[PDB]
Amino acid sequence: HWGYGKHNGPEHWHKDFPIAKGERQSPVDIDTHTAKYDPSLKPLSVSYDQATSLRILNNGHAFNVEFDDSQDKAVLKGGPLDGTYRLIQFHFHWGSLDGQGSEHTVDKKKYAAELHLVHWNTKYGDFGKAVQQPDGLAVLGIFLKVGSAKPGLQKVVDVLDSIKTKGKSADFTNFDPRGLLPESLDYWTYPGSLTTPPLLECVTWIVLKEPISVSSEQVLKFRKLNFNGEGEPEELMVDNWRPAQPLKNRQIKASFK
Ligand SMILES: CC(=O)/N=c1\sc(S(N)(=O)=O)nn1C
Numbered sequence: 529h530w531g532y533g534k535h536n537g538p539e540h541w542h543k544d545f546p547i548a549k550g551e552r553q554s555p556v557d558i559d560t561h562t563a564k565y566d567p568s569l570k571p572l573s574v575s576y577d578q579a580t581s582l583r584i585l586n587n588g589h590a591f592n593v594e595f596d597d598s599q600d601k602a603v604l605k606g607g608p609l610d611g612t613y614r615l616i617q618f619h620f621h622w623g624s625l626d627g628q629g630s631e632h633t634v635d636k637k638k639y640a641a642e643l644h645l646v647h648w649n650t651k652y653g654d655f656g657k658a659v660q661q662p663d664g665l666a667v668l669g670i671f672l673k674v675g676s677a678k679p680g681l682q683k684v685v686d687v688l689d690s691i692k693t694k695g696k697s698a699d700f701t702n703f704d705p706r707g708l709l710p711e712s713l714d715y716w717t718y719p720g721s722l723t724t725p726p727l728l729e730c731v732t733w734i735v736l737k738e739p740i741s742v743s744s745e746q747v748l749k750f751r752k753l754n755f756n757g758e759g760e761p762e763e764l765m766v767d768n769w770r771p772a773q774p775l776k777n778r779q780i781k782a783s784f785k
């Protein structure tokens with residue numbers, strides 16, 4: 529099965545998922561000098577005050593925090609989007625070292641980790657239908673850099689012990705994802721794909737320009753997770769990121785000048 533090790537990592541995915549070599553794959557490098565300011569772009573509208581987190585799960589590739597998405601509780605609108613997108617889960621990608629870990633890069637700069645808030649277009653009725661549509665998902669990407677601790681992340685960091693191996697989950701209620709947002713919502717946007725298999729090209733990416741900072745100690749706790757399941761050989765969950773893919777026929781737009 530696919531993963532991030534040397535025999536089954538990203539450069540192998542195309543043998544099982546040939547869309548890996550598609551025209552609108554993610555992530556990409558954001559060249560800040562060739563991105564186009566588009567004043568047609570609206571501000572983002574993040575409405576997370578009624579969010580209901582349910583659970584945190586180690587799925588063998590990352591950990592996900594899952595939300596109740598059976599109603600318009602936590603939604604994303606505005607920006608380049610049409611319609612209403614519901615939050616279903618968030619997860620991170622991170623590195624073995626502080627100089628790598630993010631999926632997107634900015635003028636080839638890598639960050640220590642990248643947060644993905646995944647949302648699906650309610651007009652398609654459920655997540656599984658949405659991933660079949662070119663406008664079905666909107667993923668908010670936020671970079672993490674190492675510096676001062678992020679207090680709103682510590683609830684997540686503290687439970688990681690209880691989901692160390694693949695397939696473990698824990699109740700994770702009353703977590704407020706607003707505590708993970710930077711001060712500014714300026715962004716870049718481009719049409720792209722999921723960054724793990726099945727690599728479907730159904731995502732409007734919205735990548736925030738301002739990183740959040742987390743402490744060394746917080747990211748170190750990410751690095752103690754396991755890709756393996758309980759009882760199996762320990763393989764630390766690190767470097768679960770996909771490298772930048774060719775931009776091909778796409779334009780990155782910026783909401784700011
Ligand atoms: C969110 C979900 O159910 N799946 C995902 S989200 C995703 S990501 N990385 O955000 O692009 N990749 N995949 C396969």
Ligand SMILES: [Zn+2]
Pocket residue numbers: 619620621644723
């Ligand atoms: Zn992701």
